[PDB]
Design a protein around this ligand. Structure first.
Ligand SMILES: CCCCCCCCCCCCCCCCCC(=O)OC[C@H](COP(=O)([O-])OCC(O)COP(=O)([O-])OC[C@@H](COC(=O)CCCCCCCCCCCCCCCCC)OC(=O)CCCCCCCCCCCCCCCCC)OC(=O)CCCCCCCCCCCCCCCCC
Ligand SMILES: CCCCCCCCCCCCCCCCCC(=O)OC[C@H](COP(=O)([O-])OCC(O)COP(=O)([O-])OC[C@@H](COC(=O)CCCCCCCCCCCCCCCCC)OC(=O)CCCCCCCCCCCCCCCCC)OC(=O)CCCCCCCCCCCCCCCCC
Ligand SMILES: CCCCCCCCCCCCCCCCCC(=O)OC[C@H](COP(=O)([O-])OCC(O)COP(=O)([O-])OC[C@@H](COC(=O)CCCCCCCCCCCCCCCCC)OC(=O)CCCCCCCCCCCCCCCCC)OC(=O)CCCCCCCCCCCCCCCCC
Ligand SMILES: CCCCCCCCCCCCCCCCC[C@@H](O)O[C@H](CO[C@H](O)CCCCCCCCCCCCCCC)COP(=O)(O)OCC[N+](C)(C)C
Ligand SMILES: CCCCCCCCCCCCCCCCC[C@@H](O)O[C@H](CO[C@H](O)CCCCCCCCCCCCCCC)COP(=O)(O)OCC[N+](C)(C)C
Ligand SMILES: CCCCCCCCCCCCCCCCC[C@@H](O)O[C@H](CO[C@H](O)CCCCCCCCCCCCCCC)COP(=O)(O)OCC[N+](C)(C)C
Ligand SMILES: CCCCCCCC/C=C\CCCCCCCC(=O)O[C@H](COC(=O)CCCCCCC/C=C/CCCCCCCC)COP(=O)(O)OCCN
Ligand SMILES: Nc1ncnc2c1ncn2[C@@H]1O[C@H](COP(=O)(O)OP(=O)(O)O)[C@@H](O)[C@H]1O
Lengths: 121, 56, 107, 320, 42, 459, 40, 347
């Protein structure tokens, strides 16, 4: 799935207008919480490299780390959800438009399917 | 002494809190798997007069 | 050869320290007697008293979710029924043959 | 605004600070002499900044609080033991020499930083140049091994190849009989044991190698004990001569920016003082290194950065 | 060295964090409202 | 399953926010409480499983391993308290952090409804063990040992990953439930043979298989006591658990492909039991005994009959407990004598009688004395092998005889005879060591009362 | 009684120009501490 | 040099790369490459020594030969179709000329010989720039024409690069040469998935740039260019050595570290195309990179090497200059595996 040449794709939009028809991620999203945790880890490592009390050196700086990570993670999650939604939409449209390439299998019960049996001895 | 041993024993409360949070999260994840509640052929049950869901 | 035979500046290897020396009743946990005693107490209480006894009693009285007595009662009533009706106890077929469609060979 | 590329970009230039009076100068003299007095007198007369001769705990005076640390945490060497037993088995002589060379490198870096940042010149005692003479003495008396002198030469080359030598050097000439008489007159028991052969070897090194090599790239003022008493004549000699043969006139504003970046950030100054050459006199095992590093960390204002130490009394930690 | 907590930097850091959080809360609100209006939920 | 995972994660901030002299107490208490909480996973069903969510599920094969993993951490902390006394607070906190991370990865590995998630955690366990071995080991060989313990593992595990993704590209899923319900036979093909090998070799190397066991003696001998305990008790069982999970897609090709591994295990158990008879190091002898027991478990899994699987589960649990106890006894001797040579300190019964009793009971469980769960697993596997082929009885009985021989040789050499005269620093046993020994041994003799808890899902 | 730590001889394994020295590469020399060669 | 001139040259290098990235005309892509090469040389020669001059002249010779080959490919493509737009080539010979030119620019085997020597000659900051920013333009061009490449040639060069990097890193004591061989191996990993998925190529490029930035900034912070110099860092900055060990573990591809994300994904992608043998060999060869990363970790943080007495003085000083993005680089290079599906952002 290369979508670079997909028709009606504005070159440098992070989020197209149609992406606004999708539900935005909740602020309590586990992925957003992981982004905030990554920001907190970055703050702790920054304190450690500078030889400052790791947990309680700069609260403003750690807060800024967490906030920036959460902000970028929110927008990244929106874009990721939009791209997966496009993939599903295109897949379903292609299956719909090419019925001869996706014929329906005849529903068959196990009562009349002969599976070879291999004993364990 | 209160407000003094707290500053020395605050860490102890964390593990117990985690256990409660994990139980809450397990129930919350259970709430997302109710697509077949009271719908399985084995346990198709007619609800009691004062019942909403068979299980939570 | 004015070399010192001292290849580098190194601390001598320290001798091991006996916990019984500075403190009899040492319990082998810590060199601080108070922390030592409380470490012994917490290990003994939460290991032998809480987990080992209460957990063992909890495992002993676990409800029958494996359905051993349930299967026994089902088999008891099923055997009572088949013995009363003269049915040949267990059948050799696990599924009814009427609802299986074999492929005709015509060989 | 801590000095960096941006300060250079906007306004910060040091060519305008140079007012033909800077004249980084150094004084060389035999053990126990008037060089200290002469250096100070030159410093007050010329308006320069005097730098007392670097000791074992010179670095202790510039970091944390200026008070010196323990011998085990700072230097791991002593001059008194070197005087008492120069042929020691634990290699105190070369460890002392290496620590003193590193201290002189740090002090030269500090002096260059002051001169480049303020425009005010400095006066120094024995610098990174002429620090080798003692080394040569220790080799000729047999106090140290040869591998020590190759290691010292390697470190000295890699370090001193990046700084500007002093404008004019002032050497006070003192004969050995009178140097020993002055040593006996001081009353220091440990200096009593300096053999005349050591002093004579030290003297030979300055004249044979140090004087001609600084004569061809700098200006030299040979003085005796009598003529070093009157600093007016010495100051007049400094004023009359003009430095035009050294590398200093060839320096310009960007090279000065590079040198000012180098003299700051003392870790890069001392970077090659710990090259991984394993000489038994100076290499330290992992266990002793770990124990001593742990001891150093536990010092009051040494666990964290200078502004982040609660036990010293730094406040507002959680907002810095 | 010997320096005070730079209240300009502290104020700027707190302001950036607060502005980003307020912007994020607003953006989520109009995102939810736009999704509901587009999909005809409410 | 989060009600166990979250407290194990909270063990880390609690460890790092503790006082300098409270880390061991807090870690031990809260790890014991986590073990007690995890003990409630033992209430399993006769039906499918405890499917908590899309990510984690529990099974009566997974539950005993989870409980043993949670129980091992307090014992590891008690064993590590002694030799870490002279070390800084930050480094001790780092050591406890490595142990906690190992427990977390093992817990998530044993539930791991996804095969790729199982692989990721099953390989994530590698890092803490390597750091523990190569950082807090004593001898100079530890680095070399670490290298072995690394590359062997990856040499087996890299093909598996490829196979795994290949399966999902054909089947469409790697969820264990979907795999079990939608399983299909493997045709006798070269491609299928190599898929079988890629699926099996990764778990074979960590049992370890007899030919592939070189890393184990090094890694177990050069590791600290906590490292040896976790390596012998839980980390060796990852291969058995993975084989028990993955053999569902390998039928009927297992019938042909099992022969070389069956021969390797049946002969290597004899070889390693014989090696134990001539060993100058206690830790190496215990490591080779572990190799023999895991060879028996490999045979059981390869036979793939109900009695085989029950015996293999029981033997895995029993071996974990017994080997941890044996390593702890060896370390108690070592911390006094500092030599780790079996012949040096002799006649320790006359100086340490209670420790001699602990040695006797550990040797008895290693000897598979009935009605211990060690013998329950041994006998179930032996009966299954006898049904598989009546000639296996010769090899199995020879292994039993040699096992008894080397266990009693180990007991007699160290505890009986005359004390060494020049050794005068044998101090009385501490309460910590005796408590550690009891906390190893009472669970075994108490599990022999309720065997169905450790007999697996085919009970 | 004490954990082993690398000594000087262990460290000198990693001090050559390359690892795994050969007869041809024996005469190679490690680069200068500062990446400057004498102009000769 | 003058900071103004240095900033101008850095922006000229970035503008050349940008010119390559935003243009649709082959002449403008060639011009961007020329601009990048022209402004890159003084950066390599910022600190004057004979070794830096030798590195710069070798780099110039290689890049100029590659540029001439690339222009030859452009002109042949124009000859067989009067097109200037960067798209499918339309000529078999032209594509090969283009592929070899871009392989020479990237440093892929068998055109790898210049990378270790140039990296060793130049300083650490120059090496950071050379190994991070100088791969964007050739890889972007390769992504644009990926539908044209012969898979046989690209896959051969990718496997050769992986093998050469793995084998050549085993023999190194110098840190810059280790980084160069690591970069060669990572380029080999990147170019093996171009025929199938350019998104995986970009993901591998981003992860590799993050890890390389973290490792170079750690090496600059603890100013070491040899193994033995790095072995002294624990006696001053043990936390730096711990971070470096974790970063090295990530660079070796161990789960659950970030470095496992690319190879895994790449392997996964290559399996969707019925390619089984090649990913297997690639992973087995990456074990060599892991071996020499582990040797570095043993020498740096997992064991305590002997120190010297003068180190005590270094205990009294702290770094004046700091990298703001170093903690973020470390975290992004070690702990982003849970965020793998975000690769749908077409990064
Ligand atoms: C995705 C792809 C990512 C690619 C990888 C990122 C490439 C990073 C390298 C960029 C260039 C070198 C560099 O920035 O050093 C890295 C730097 C390490 O610093 P260093 O190597 O110690 O620097 C030594 C200097 O070269 C020593 O130079 P100096 O002391 O002369 O510096 C003075 C300073 C100050 O310059 C000024 O005074 C500005 C004057 C303005 C004049 C304007 C004139 C306009 C005409 O100028 C600079 O430092 C460079 C300015 C570049 C500006 C470009 C726009 O750390 C990073 O930048 C990492 C960045 C994070 C990754 C990339 C960004 C996220 C993605
Ligand atoms: C036989 C019936 C017993 C009924 C009474 C209840 C006994 C309860 C014991 C529970 C387990 C003991 C805990 C282990 C650590 C020992 C603690 C200790 O240090 O002692 C300090 C204490 C004070 O002595 P001290 O002077 O201060 O210390 C001086 C030195 O330590 C020197 O001390 P020492 O020289 O006196 O040696 C200490 C002693 C104790 O140390 C041990 O060796 C005990 C562990 C031996 C087992 C080894 C593993 C093999 C697997 C067997 C699993 C059976 C467990 C069943 C369920 C248990 C539930 C937790 O070792 C022996 O004397 C060697 C005995 C060899 C017995 C081998 C036969 C095993 C199979 C027997 C039948 C089992 C199934 C029957 C089925 C049919 C009937 C219903 O000494 C004692 O109290 C002796 C302990 C009692 C002797 C145990 C012998 C038979 C018990 C078998 C387990 C329970 C059977 C259940 C069936 C009931 C009907
Ligand atoms: C699975 C996911 C879940 C788990 C996540 C795991 C990762 C999470 C954290 C990630 C990174 C964050 C922290 C890193 C910054 C470094 C900090 C540090 O150095 O430690 C010192 C610092 C304490 O020391 P200090 O007195 O402040 O200053 C002294 C110096 O800092 C230090 O003194 P020194 O420098 O003089 O001592 C020297 C020492 C110092 O050097 C170090 O220790 C550096 C630390 C290692 C670097 C980590 C690399 C980046 C992280 C990636 C980890 C990969 C994980 C994947 C699995 C593979 C495992 C490797 O270096 C050595 O000894 C070298 C030899 C050691 C052996 C080889 C090293 C092994 C490295 C593997 C470590 C992996 C786990 C680290 C756990 C966190 C460590 C604090 O530790 C801390 O306090 C920070 C811990 C975290 C704070 C938690 C606060 C939350 C608690 C309250 C809120 C409750 C939350 C729940 C809410 C509900 C409540 C109601
Ligand atoms: C010192 C000298 C001796 C003095 C003491 C004398 C007294 C000795 C008596 C004790 C031993 C004699 C054996 C007699 C056993 C009596 C109790 C037994 O019958 O109860 C067992 C019950 O106990 C449990 O089955 C076994 C305990 C489970 C052990 C769990 C381990 C604890 C957790 C520790 C961490 C885990 C580490 C290992 C990981 C795998 C079996 O009962 P069961 O017929 O079946 O059903 C229970 C009752 N029902 C019918 C209502 C259901
Ligand atoms: C070293 C420590 C232990 C490590 C692990 C050891 C375990 C690995 C053992 C591998 C298991 C078996 C591998 C192949 C089994 C196939 C059956 C074969 O042995 O029998 C004959 C196979 O014939 C020959 O073997 C053909 C191959 C000959 C080349 C093989 C090399 C022989 C020795 C190599 C062993 C080296 C192993 C280690 C490699 C690094 C039957 O021939 P045929 O009925 O017609 O074809 C059956 C296969 N079909 C049906 C799919 C077509
Ligand atoms: C290892 C961590 C790497 C993190 C990367 C750096 C993070 C800081 C970046 C700062 C913000 C970047 C956003 C840029 C703003 C506008 C974006 C716009 O210009 O580009 C769009 C697209 O932007 C990027 O594609 C999105 C970048 C997001 C990268 C994150 C995915 C990394 C994989 C998951 C690892 C976990 C990382 C998350 C933790 C921080 C449209 O691109 P388009 O012109 O149409 O086609 C070019 C690309 N093609 C050729 C492949 C088709
Ligand atoms: C302890 C160190 C052990 C090292 C690893 C040991 C395990 C070796 C197992 C093989 C490794 C790779 C196997 C591939 C992974 C499974 C993928 C698969 O099954 O797909 C096969 C692909 O099969 C292969 O490609 C196998 C090629 C193997 C090449 C590498 C050989 C490695 C050494 C071979 C001799 C030793 C084999 C057993 C060694 C056991 C360990 C000692 C069929 O797919 P298709 O071809 O697409 O469909 C058929 C129609 N075209
Ligand atoms: N590089 C060095 N090597 C050995 N000793 C040195 C070195 N530098 C200074 N010293 C010692 O410092 C001491 C004081 O120096 P000096 O100027 O001779 O005496 P004073 O301080 O009274 O003027 C002397 O005893 C000298 O030996």
């Amino acid at each position: 799935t290369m979508m670079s040449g997909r028709p009606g794709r504005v070159p440098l939009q992070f989020l197209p207008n149609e992406a606004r028809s999708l539900p935005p991620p909740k602020l309590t999203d586990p992925r957003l919480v992981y982004m905030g945790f990554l920001g907190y880890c970055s703050g702790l490592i920054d304190n450690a490299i500078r030889r400052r009390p790791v947990v309680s050196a700069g609260l403003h700086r750690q807060l800024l780390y967490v906030t920036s990570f959460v902000f970028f993670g929110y927008y990244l999650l929106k874009r990721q959800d939009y791209m997966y939604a496009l993939r599903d939409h295109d897949m379903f449209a292609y299956v719909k438009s090419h019925p001869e390439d996706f014929p329906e299998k005849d529903k068959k019960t196990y009562g009349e399917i002969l599976e070879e049996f291999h004993p364990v001895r | 002494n209160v407000l003094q041993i707290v500053r020395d024993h605050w860490v102890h409360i964390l593990v117990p809190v985690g256990f409660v949070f994990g139980c809450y999260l397990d129930r919350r994840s259970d709430e997302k798997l109710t697509a077949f509640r009271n719908k399985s052929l084995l346990f198709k049950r007619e609800l009691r007069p004062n019942e909403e869901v068979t299980w939570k | 050869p004015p070399e010192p035979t001292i290849r580098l500046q190194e601390d001598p290897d320290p001798e091991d320290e006996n916990l019984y020396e500075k403190n009899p009743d040492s319990h082998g946990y810590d060199k601080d007697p108070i922390v030592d005693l409380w470490n012994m107490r917490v290990v003994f209480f939460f290991g032998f008293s809480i987990v080992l006894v209460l957990g063992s009693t909890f495992v002993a009285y676990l409800p029958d979710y494996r359905m051993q007595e349930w299967a026994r009662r089902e088999a008891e009533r099923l055997v009572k029924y088949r013995e009363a009706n003269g049915l040949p106890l267990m059948e050799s077929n696990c599924f009814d043959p009427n609802k299986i469609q074999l492929p005709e060979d015509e060989d | 605004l801590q000095y960096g590329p941006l300060a250079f970009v906007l306004g910060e230039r040091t060519t305008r600070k140079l007012t033909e009076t800077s004249k980084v100068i150094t004084v060389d003299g035999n053990i126990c002499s008037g060089k200290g007095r002469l250096a100070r007198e030159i410093a007050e007369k010329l308006g320069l900044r005097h730098f007392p001769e670097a000791g074992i705990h010179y670095a202790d005076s510039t970091t944390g609080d200026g008070k010196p640390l323990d011998v085990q945490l700072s230097g791991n060497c002593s001059l008194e033991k070197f005087y008492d037993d120069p042929k020691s088995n634990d290699g105190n002589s070369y460890r002392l020499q290496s620590w003193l060379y590193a201290s002189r490198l740090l002090q030269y870096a500090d002096a260059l930083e002051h001169l480049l940042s303020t425009g005010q010149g400095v006066v120094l005692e024995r610098s990174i140049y002429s620090d080798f003479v003692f080394l040569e003495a220790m080799y000729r008396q047999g106090f140290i091994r040869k591998q020590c002198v190759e290691h010292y030469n390697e470190v000295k080359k890699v370090t001193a190849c990046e700084y500007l030598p002093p404008h004019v050097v002032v050497y006070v000439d003192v004969p050995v009989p009178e140097i020993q008489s002055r040593i006996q007159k001081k009353g220091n028991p440990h200096e009593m044991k300096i053999t005349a052969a050591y002093l004579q070897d030290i003297e030979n090194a300055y004249k044979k190698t140090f004087l001609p090599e600084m004569s061809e790239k700098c200006e030299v003022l040979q003085y005796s004990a009598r003529e070093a008493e009157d600093a007016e004549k010495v100051v007049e000699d400094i004023e009359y001569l003009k430095c035009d043969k050294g590398p200093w006139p060839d320096q310009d504003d960007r090279t000065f920016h590079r040198l000012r970046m180098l003299v700051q950030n003392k870790l890069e100054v001392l970077n090659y003082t710990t090259i991984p050459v394993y000489l038994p006199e100076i290499t330290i095992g992992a266990h002793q290194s770990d124990r001593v590093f742990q001891k150093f960390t536990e010092l009051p204002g040494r666990k964290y950065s200078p502004g982040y130490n609660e036990d010293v009394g730094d406040k507002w930690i959680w907002l810095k | 060295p010997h320096g005070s907590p730079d209240w300009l930097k502290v104020g700027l850091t707190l302001g950036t964090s607060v502005f980003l959080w307020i912007y994020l809360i607003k953006q989520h609100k109009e995102d939810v409202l736009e999704y509901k209006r587009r999909n005809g939920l409410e | 399953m989060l009600k166990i995972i979250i407290p194990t994660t909270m063990l880390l901030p609690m460890t790092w926010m503790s006082k300098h002299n409270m880390i061991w107490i807090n870690a031990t208490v809260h790890s014991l409480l986590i073990s007690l909480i995890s003990l409630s996973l033992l209430n399993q069903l006769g039906e499918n499983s405890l499917n908590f969510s899309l990510t984690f599920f529990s099974d009566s094969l997974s539950a005993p391993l989870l409980v043993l993993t949670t129980w091992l951490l307090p014992l590891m902390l008690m064993a590590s308290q002694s030799h870490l006394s002279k070390e800084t607070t930050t480094r001790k906190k780092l050591y406890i952090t490595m142990l906690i991370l190992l427990q977390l990865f093992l817990i998530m590995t044993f539930t791991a409804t996804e095969l790729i998630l199982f692989y990721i955690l099953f390989e994530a366990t590698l890092v803490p063990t390597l750091i523990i071995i190569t950082r807090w080991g004593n001898q100079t060989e530890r680095l070399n040992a670490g290298l072995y313990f690394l590359f062997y593992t990856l040499a087996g595990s890299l093909p598996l990953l490829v196979a795994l993704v290949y399966i999902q590209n054909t089947t469409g899923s790697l969820n264990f439930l979907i795999i079990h319900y939608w399983s299909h036979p493997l045709s006798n093909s070269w491609s299928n043979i190599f898929m079988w090998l890629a699926c099996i070799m990764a778990f074979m190397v960590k049992m370890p298989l007899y030919g592939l066991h070189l890393w184990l003696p090094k890694a177990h001998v050069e590791a600290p006591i906590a490292g040896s305990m976790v390596l012998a008790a839980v980390l060796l069982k990852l291969g058995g658990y993975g084989m028990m999970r993955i053999t569902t897609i390998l039928n009927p090709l297992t019938n042909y492909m099992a022969y070389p591994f069956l021969m390797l295990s049946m002969w290597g158990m004899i070889m390693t039991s014989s090696i134990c008879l001539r060993q100058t190091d206690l830790k190496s002898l215990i490591a080779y005994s572990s190799v023999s027991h895991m060879a028996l478990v490999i045979v059981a899994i390869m036979i793939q009959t109900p009695w085989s699987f029950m015996g293999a589960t029981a033997l895995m649990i029993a071996h974990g407990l017994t080997s941890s106890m044996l390593f702890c006894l060896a370390n108690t001797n070592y911390e006094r004598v500092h030599s780790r040579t079996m012949i040096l300190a002799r006649g320790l019964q006359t100086l340490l009688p209670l420790m001699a009793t602990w040695w006797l009971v550990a040797s008895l469980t290693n000897l598979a004395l009935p009605p211990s769960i060690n013998l329950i697993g041994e006998l179930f596997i032996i009966t299954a092998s006898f049904s598989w082929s009546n000639i296996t009885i010769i090899l199995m009985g020879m292994n039993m005889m040699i096992t008894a021989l080397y266990s009693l040789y180990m007991l007699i050499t160290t505890q009986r005879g005359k004390y060494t005269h020049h050794i005068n620093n044998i101090k009385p046993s501490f309460t910590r060591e005796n408590a550690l020994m009891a906390l190893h041994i009472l669970p075994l003799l108490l599990l022999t009362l309720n065997p169905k808890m450790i007999l697996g899902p085919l009970y | 009684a004490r954990q082993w730590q690398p000594d000087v001889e262990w460290a000198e394994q990693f001090g050559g120009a390359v690892m795994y020295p050969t007869k041809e590469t024996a005469h190679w020399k490690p680069p200068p501490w500062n990446d400057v060669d004498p102009p000769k | 040099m003058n900071p103004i001139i240095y900033t101008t040259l850095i922006m000229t290098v970035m503008s050349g790369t940008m010119l390559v990235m935003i243009s649709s005309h082959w002449l403008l892509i060639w011009i961007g490459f020329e601009m990048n090469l022209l402004a890159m040389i003084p950066v390599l020669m910022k600190n004057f020594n004979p070794r830096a001059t030798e590195a710069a002249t070798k780099y110039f010779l290689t890049q100029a030969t590659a540029s001439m080959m690339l222009m030859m490919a452009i002109i042949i493509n124009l000859l067989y179709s009067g097109q200037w737009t960067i798209t499918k080539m339309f000529n078999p010979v032209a594509m090969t000329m283009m592929t070899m030119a871009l392989a020479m620019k990237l440093g892929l085997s068998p055109f790898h010989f210049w990378v270790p020597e140039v990296t060793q000659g130049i300083s650490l900051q120059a090496g950071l720039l050379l190994l991070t920013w100088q791969k964007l333009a050739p890889l972007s061009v390769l992504c644009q024409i990926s539908q044209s490449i012969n898979p046989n040639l690209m896959l051969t060069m990718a496997m050769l690069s992986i093998l050469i990097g793995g084998w050549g890193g085993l023999n190194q004591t110098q840190l810059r040469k280790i980084m160069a061989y690591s970069s060669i191996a990572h380029m080999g990993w990147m170019t093996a998935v171009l025929p199938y998925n350019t998104t995986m190529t970009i993901l591998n490029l981003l992860i590799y740039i993050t890890m390389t930035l973290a490792m170079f900034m750690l090496l600059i912070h603890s100013s070491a260019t040899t193994t033995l110099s790095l072995s002294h860092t624990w006696n001053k900055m043990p936390v730096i050595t711990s971070l470096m060990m974790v970063t090295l573990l990530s660079m070796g591809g161990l789960p659950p570290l970030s470095g496992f994300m690319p190879k895994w994904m790449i392997i996964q992608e290559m399996t969707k195309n019925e390619s089984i043998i090649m990913p297997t060999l690639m992973a087995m060869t990456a074990l060599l990179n892991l071996y020499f990363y582990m040797r570095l970790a043993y020498s740096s943080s997992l064991t305590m090497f002997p120190s010297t007495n003068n180190m005590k003085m270094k205990w009294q000083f702290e770094h004046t200059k700091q990298m703001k993005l170093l903690p973020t680089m470390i975290v992004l290079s070690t702990l982003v595996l849970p965020m793998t599906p975000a690769l749908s952002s077409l990064n």
